Amino acid sequence: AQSVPWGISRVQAPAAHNRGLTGSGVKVAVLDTGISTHPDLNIRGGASFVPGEPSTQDGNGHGTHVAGTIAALDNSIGVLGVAPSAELYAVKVLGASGSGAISSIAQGLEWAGNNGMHVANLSLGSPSPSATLEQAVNSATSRGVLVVAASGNSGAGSISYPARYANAMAVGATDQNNNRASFSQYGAGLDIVAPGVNVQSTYPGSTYASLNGTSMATPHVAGAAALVKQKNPSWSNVQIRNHLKNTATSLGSTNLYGSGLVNAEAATR
Ligand SMILES: [Ca+2]
Ligand SMILES: [Ca+2]
């Protein structure tokens, strides 16, 4: 039996699926710890920029979890992604330890722009700015990639890099009450929020696990971006990004929530 995680129904993904929008034909790169083969995922390809882990398989669990929020297959098992038909690419930029070098992350973004990815999911972030990282964000953006990044989990009134950068779409996390999760970074540069507490998804070892974080919120928006892209195949990264913000449900302060909660129903109308 397939279950629909609360976050998926919170962002109203099923409303979009009911109109025929599933992310079909949209290429989404998950820049993380890799993506493990799983019965509820369809991994189209990818690359590893982690020296010492040539494989795109996930030795951590985060990347597989993020992948499932975006595109867990719509079938009779497991869970269901926001964009269950999106074409998923495993871009390994973090090691099994869940940490990685900036250069690996910048190589992953270059790879994304070089391979015609429409969306790049970066559920990672640093409190420090990086010239190298910034340039990779800007380069992928001018190659038509929508870069979606986590705001961070410090609970501070300032957001992480690269989410802070103008060309990154910064995603904060909400709980089941539609309040900002205590750990969710907010402040200047925050674009939007999505579910990030008790998020159930795919996990290595052919199972399912629940995690918390701004990393969990981000894929809901990457997924929402693929739905909009499918509906409006001529739209650019910027057009998609503004539309998502324009159709988000206000939750109160833009300092805390940016545009508000992503809404895939409103975005695909
Ligand atoms: Ca499924
Ligand atoms: Ca931003």
Curated annotation (Swiss-Prot):
Coiled-coil ranges (or none): none
EC number(s) stated in the UniProt entry for this protein: 3.4.21.62
Cofactor list: Ca(2+)
Annotated InterPro entries: Peptidase_S8/S53_dom, Peptidase_S8/S53_dom_sf, Peptidase_S8_Asp-AS, Peptidase_S8_His-AS, Peptidase_S8_Ser-AS, Peptidase_S8_subtilisin-like, Peptidase_S8_subtilisin-rel, Subtilisin_Carlsberg-like
One of the protein's GO biological processes: proteolysis
Function: Subtilisin is an extracellular alkaline serine protease, it catalyzes the hydrolysis of proteins and peptide amides.
This protein's name: Subtilisin Savinase
Originating organism: Lederbergia lenta (Bacillus lentus)
